[PDB]
Design an enzyme around this catalytic site. Sequence first.
Site, PDB file in Angstrom:
ATOM      1  N   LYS B  86      -2.510  -2.475   2.230  1.00 43.42           N
ATOM      2  CA  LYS B  86      -2.912  -2.955   0.898  1.00 43.42           C
ATOM      3  C   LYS B  86      -2.188  -4.243   0.469  1.00 43.42           C
ATOM      4  O   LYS B  86      -2.741  -5.096  -0.242  1.00 43.42           O
ATOM      5  CB  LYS B  86      -2.682  -1.863  -0.149  1.00 43.42           C
ATOM      6  N   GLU B 108      -6.276  -0.587  -9.968  1.00 41.42           N
ATOM      7  CA  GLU B 108      -6.384   0.859  -9.804  1.00 41.42           C
ATOM      8  C   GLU B 108      -5.593   1.321  -8.572  1.00 41.42           C
ATOM      9  O   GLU B 108      -5.403   0.531  -7.660  1.00 41.42           O
ATOM     10  CB  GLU B 108      -7.871   1.253  -9.721  1.00 41.42           C
ATOM     11  N   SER B 376      -2.807   2.526   9.039  1.00 39.34           N
ATOM     12  CA  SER B 376      -2.913   1.730   7.822  1.00 39.34           C
ATOM     13  C   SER B 376      -1.695   1.836   6.915  1.00 39.34           C
ATOM     14  O   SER B 376      -1.454   0.926   6.119  1.00 39.34           O
ATOM     15  CB  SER B 376      -4.213   2.052   7.115  1.00 39.34           C
TER      16      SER B 376
HETATM   17  C1  LIG Z   1      -6.181   4.558  -2.698  1.00 36.55           C
HETATM   18  C2  LIG Z   1      -5.059   3.883  -2.218  1.00 36.55           C
HETATM   19  N1  LIG Z   1      -4.802   3.879  -0.874  1.00 36.55           N
HETATM   20  C3  LIG Z   1      -5.683   4.072   0.041  1.00 36.55           C
HETATM   21  C4  LIG Z   1      -5.342   3.968   1.468  1.00 36.55           C
HETATM   22  C5  LIG Z   1      -6.339   3.917   2.450  1.00 36.55           C
HETATM   23  C6  LIG Z   1      -7.813   3.975   2.130  1.00 36.55           C
HETATM   24  O1  LIG Z   1      -8.308   2.778   1.461  1.00 36.55           O
HETATM   25  P1  LIG Z   1      -9.188   1.723   2.283  1.00 36.55           P
HETATM   26  O2  LIG Z   1     -10.425   2.455   2.807  1.00 36.55           O
HETATM   27  O3  LIG Z   1      -9.529   0.653   1.209  1.00 36.55           O
HETATM   28  O4  LIG Z   1      -8.364   1.146   3.381  1.00 36.55           O
HETATM   29  C7  LIG Z   1      -5.942   3.818   3.750  1.00 36.55           C
HETATM   30  N2  LIG Z   1      -4.656   3.836   4.153  1.00 36.55           N
HETATM   31  C8  LIG Z   1      -3.688   3.867   3.252  1.00 36.55           C
HETATM   32  C9  LIG Z   1      -2.252   3.861   3.659  1.00 36.55           C
HETATM   33  C10 LIG Z   1      -3.996   3.940   1.901  1.00 36.55           C
HETATM   34  O5  LIG Z   1      -2.928   3.987   1.083  1.00 36.55           O
HETATM   35  C11 LIG Z   1      -4.185   3.160  -3.029  1.00 36.55           C
HETATM   36  O6  LIG Z   1      -3.166   2.829  -2.536  1.00 36.55           O
HETATM   37  O7  LIG Z   1      -4.470   2.958  -4.183  1.00 36.55           O
END
Ligand SMILES: C=C(/N=C/c1c(COP(=O)(O)O)cnc(C)c1O)C(=O)O
Lengths: 268, 394
Positions: B86, B108, B376
Site C-alpha cells: 500500500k 479509508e 503483499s
Molecule cells: C484493506 C487494506 N489492506 C488490504 C490488503 C490487501 C488487499 O487489497 P488490494 O486487493 O488492494 O491489494 C492485500 N495485502 C495486504 C497486506 C493488505 O493490507 C488496508 O490496508 O486498508
Amino acid sequence: MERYENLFAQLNDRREGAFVPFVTLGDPGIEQSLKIIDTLIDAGADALELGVPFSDPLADGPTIQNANLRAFAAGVTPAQCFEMLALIREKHPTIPIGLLMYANLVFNNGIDAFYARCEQVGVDSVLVADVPVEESAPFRQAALRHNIAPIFICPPNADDDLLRQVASYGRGYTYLLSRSGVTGAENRGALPLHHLIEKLKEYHAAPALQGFGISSPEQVSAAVRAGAAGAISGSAIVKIIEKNLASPKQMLAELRSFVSAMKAASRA
Amino acid sequence: TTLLNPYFGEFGGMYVPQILMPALNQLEEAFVSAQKDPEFQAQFADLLKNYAGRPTALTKCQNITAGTRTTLYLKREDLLHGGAHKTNQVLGQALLAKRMGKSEIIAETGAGQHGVASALASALLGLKCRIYMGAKDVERQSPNVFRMRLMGAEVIPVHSGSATLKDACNEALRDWSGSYETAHYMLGTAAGPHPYPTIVREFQRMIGEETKAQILDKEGRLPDAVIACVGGGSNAIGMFADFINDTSVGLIGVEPGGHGIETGEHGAPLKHGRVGIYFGMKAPMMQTADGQIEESYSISAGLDFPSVGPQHAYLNSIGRADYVSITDDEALEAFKTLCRHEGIIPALESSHALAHALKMMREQPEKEQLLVVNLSGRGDKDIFTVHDILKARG
Ligand SMILES: C=C(/N=C/c1c(COP(=O)(O)O)cnc(C)c1O)C(=O)O
Ligand SMILES: O=P(O)(O)OCCNS(=O)(=O)c1ccc(OC(F)(F)F)cc1
Ligand code: NA
C-alpha cells in the site's frame, strides 16, 4: 404525462414557489409512511421526492441514512415501495412524484424494466444521485421511453458545458444543489447563486428546485426570492419522524404543522 | 469528457454525484501531466528508493517446495516501509495532492495498512490526514490504529453497516463530497471511479516490473504464473500490469472464500457476485436479489470487501487472468507453513495468495512450474488474530 409542467404553470400564475418534502418510503413502516405522505400532501406539499431504501446511500447524511435503516427494519423492499407508489398515485392523480434513486437499484435487474415499473405506478421523474450526466445515456433513454422525466443536477460547481447538457438532457425540473456534501439539515447551504438560475433560464432548462440543508421557512422564501421555482426539504421532515417514533399521532400533527409553515413561506 | 478511457470493457466508469465530477477530472488531468513530467517521476522514484526501500527482494523458497517440481519465489512487499505494498501508491498520490495544491488527505482502511501508509506519507510530505476504519477492523487490526495516531492522523471508527472496509469506503466518499476543495481523497485500492483504478495500477506497477527483472536475472525466463490476493485489486494489478502483454505468463488472482463460498460468508464477488453500480464504479459485487449491496466476510480485514476493481473484472472476462478463492482455513494453513518453513510471517491477505500456490504445487507435484506469489504484506498485524484462532482451535 405532464404533471410537472402543469404544476409549474399553476404556481407561476399564483406567484408561488413549490414546496417539496422528501421522505423515505416505508419509514418507519409501510402503513405509517402512507399516512405521513398523505399528511404532507394535505398540509400543502406541491410535489414529492420519495426515496427508495438503499443499503449504502452515499449521497445521504446520518438523518436519511437512519430513515433507510428504519425502512429495512420494517422489511421494506423496492417491490413494497412500488406498491406504495401505486397507492399514492391512486389517491392523488395530479401531484408530481419524483423518486430519489441510487444507481444499483435502477440497474439491478434491468434499467429498462425499472423505468417501465415507474411508469406503471404513475411516477413522473427519477433522479439517480450517483449517475452524472457523463454516465447518464442508458438511464435518460429508458426514462424517456417510459414517459419518465430524468432529473439532472446543477452544482454550485457548474461550468457552462454542464449547464447546456443539463438543459438538453433533463426534463420535469432541474435540481439546484445548495452546497457540496451530503443531505443534512444541520449543514445550511448558500443562497441560490443567481448566476446559475439565470443561465439555466437562458438555456430553457426545466424549472429549478433548490435542495440540501433547507429546514426553515426563511430558507424557502429565500430560494423563491432568488428566482428558483421551489425548494426541497428532506432531513428536516425526517427528523420529525425520527423524534416521534413512539407517538405516531403527534408525529403526523408535527409533520402537518411544519409542512404548512414551509409551504406558507413559498407564497410570494 | 476525459483524457483516458474510464472503462475496462464494460466495467468501471465514474458513477459519482455530479458534484464530484470536477474533482475527478482535475485528478485525471494532474495524473496525466505528472506521468509525463520527468521531475515528478524522479521525485517519486527517490521516495520509493530512499524512503520506502525499493526495490524489494524476490525470495526463493528453500523448503516449502521440496520434493516437487514447483519453484516458488515470493515478491517481498512485506519488506516495504509500513509493512505492505500500500505504501507505493500512497507516495505517488501524496505527490499528486501536492502538485494540485491540496493540503489535506482523506483515506479509508481495512487491514489498516493503507491507513498507516496514508498517515506516514502525510507526515513526511506535510499534509493533514484523516482515516476512516470500520469499528470491527479497529479491533482485529488494532496494532495499525495505534501506528496511525502516533503519526499524527485522525482515525475515525465507522459503526455503519458491517463496520468493515466497505463502510469505511462509504464514509470516506461521503466526506470528500463535502471536502474536495481542500482535501485529496487518497483511495487505497484499484477500484472506485475513474481515474483511481488507473492511477493505482500505475503507482503500483513497479511490483511486476521489478519481479520481471528479478526472475529474468535468477531464472533466465519469465514465470509460468504470478499469483496475488484480490480485495479491491491494487497489489494484484501492481504485480500483473507489466506481465499483461507477456501472453505465456499466467495471472492468477485469489479472492477470499471466507467460511466457504457455499455459506455466502466470503469476499469473492468477481467469481460469486454479479454486476452492479456502487462506490463510483460498475463492477461485480455481492448483492441481494433486489440489488442491496451484500456484506462481505473474510478472516482477513484487507480482503473483506464485496466488490473488486474493474480492470480485474475485465481481465477475467477476456480470459487473460483467472480468479480463484481460498478459505479462511486454507489461508491459516499457508500462514503457519510460511512462518515455520521460511521464517517469514505473511499478512493474512497475502496468505490467500500463498495458499493457492501451495495448492497448485500439492495437487500436481510433478508439474514443472515457476511461480511468483506477491507477498503483499507482513503479518505482524495478524498475530493476535491467528493466536486467538489457534488457541480456541486447541
Ligand atoms: C484493506 C487494506 N489492506 C488490504 C490488503 C490487501 C488487499 O487489497 P488490494 O486487493 O488492494 O491489494 C492485500 N495485502 C495486504 C497486506 C493488505 O493490507 C488496508 O490496508 O486498508
Ligand atoms: O434537506 P436535506 O439536506 O436532507 O436534502 C434532501 C435531499 N433529498 S433529494 O431526494 O432531493 C436528493 C437529491 C440529490 C441527492 O444527491 C445528489 F444530489 F447527488 F443527486 C440526494 C438526495
Ligand atoms: Na474481491
